[PDB]
Every structure is written in C-alpha cells, then in structure tokens.
Design a protein around this ligand. Structure first.
Ligand SMILES: [O-]
Ligand SMILES: [Zn+2]
Ligand SMILES: [Zn+2]
Length: 229
C-alpha cells in the first residue's frame, strides 16, 4: 500500500524496488504527480530521477534512511525537465554520484536545471556505453530515440519484471501524451516501440505521469503517437 511521507508518496513494486512520487502545483495545470524509482542493490541504494524540487528530493533521501538505511551510491536522471532533474542540488549536497545523458547535461542550464556530475553516452543501437555507467548494478540504461524530449532515456531493472519509461510512456487508459512542448513528434512512436523492444521481458512498466501498468502502456502510447505524424 501507498506510504505517505510528508508531501511525497512511496510504493513498493517488487522486493528491492520502490516508486517515489512528488507533486508540483503548476499554475494552470493542477498538482502534477511525477514518479521515479528507488532500487536496493545489495548494500547500496540506486535512485532513478529526482523529485520536482531540492526539498522534496531531500525527503526521498530521508525516506531511504528510514526505510532502507543504506547509502545511496548513485542516481540517474532521465532528461532535463524539472520533474526528473529539479532536485540535483539535494543529491549533490548528500554526496551522491549523479548521471544523465550527455545531452541532458548539455541542456540542463538552459532548462533551469543543475547538470549531473557524469555524462552517459550511447551506442548507435541505443544501449548505454558501459564505461559511462560504472557500478550501475541491475540498472540497464537505454536511449530509445527522441520522443517526449530529444534526450529522454529509459531504465530496465535486472532481476525484476520492471522497466521504467520515464515521461516517454503513458498508461493504457491515457487520453494524451502529456507535455509535448519539447517533443519530437515525428519520431515519438518509433521511440516508444524501441523502448518496448529493448526490454521485451518487462511485464510492469513504470512511468513518470501514470501509475505502473502492463505493456499495454507501451502499445497505447505508441498508437497515440502514430497520430502525431
Ligand atoms: O517532464
Ligand atoms: Zn519531461
Ligand atoms: Zn515529465
């Protein structure tokens, strides 16, 4: 069951995997939820995405201290929007090593974000170049192509049935793709399908702006994105 912890919500998804949820009251758009992940890998914790703010991200770290009580070895953030990178300073203040797509780090300042410390680069086929993601343990990072943004990346969790689509994927009941302000409308559908093809065994799809769903999230997202072309 959901655990309310201050203004955030935490939900266990699998034995070593939790979803974090934070909210930003965006005037004209309501209070928008954003989800990321927390993964225990043996004696350390790995984080996918910040919360919207530094204060909220510090609260994620407080929850981790309370409920897991192991060091956070690293965080990876999945593009240069506030829901994913807004809390970078809190991660740095805590001494956590941070990683993002090279392109996300390049875009960060202009998007009003602080860059991660380290840049991921990607092979032509989309898989992260392993030397740029040292000590990622079960996190398998994949660049599916431009979609929600040019820089969006995705993360599978080895040893689980879970893959994280970030803001690229919406659930199977969604009426729209959400914020397309920085989207690549021509390539979105193919990128959504490439995410699915990269993690073919994942039966639980986690995403930023919907609750976890089946792979119907991927097919429905791609089918909606077909209409953008
Ligand atoms: O976003
Ligand atoms: Zn975004
Ligand atoms: Zn988002």
């Amino acid at each position: 069951g959901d655990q309310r912890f201050g203004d955030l919500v935490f939900r266990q998804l699998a034995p070593n995997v939790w979803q974090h949820t934070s909210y930003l009251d965006m005037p004209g758009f309501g209070a928008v939820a954003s989800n990321g992940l927390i993964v225990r890998d043996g004696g350390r914790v790995l984080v996918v995405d910040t919360a919207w703010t530094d204060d909220q991200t510090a609260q994620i770290l407080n929850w981790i201290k309370q409920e897991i009580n192991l060091p956070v070895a690293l965080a990876v953030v999945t593009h240069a929007h506030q829901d994913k990178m807004g809390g970078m300073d809190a991660l740095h203040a805590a001494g956590i090593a941070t990683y993002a797509n090279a392109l996300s780090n390049q875009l960060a300042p202009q998007e009003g974000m602080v860059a991660a410390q380290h840049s991921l680069t990607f092979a032509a086929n989309g898989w992260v170049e392993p030397a740029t993601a040292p000590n990622f343990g079960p996190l398998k990072v994949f660049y599916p192509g431009p979609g929600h943004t040019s820089d969006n990346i995705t993360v599978g969790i080895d040893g689980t049935d879970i893959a994280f689509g970030g803001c690229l994927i919406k659930d199977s009941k969604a009426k729209s793709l959400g914020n397309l302000g920085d989207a690549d409308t021509e390539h979105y559908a193919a990128s959504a399908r490439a995410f699915g093809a990269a993690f073919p065994k994942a039966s639980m799809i986690v995403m930023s702006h919907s609750a976890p769903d089946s792979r119907a999230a991927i097919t429905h997202t791609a089918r909606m994105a077909d209409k953008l072309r």
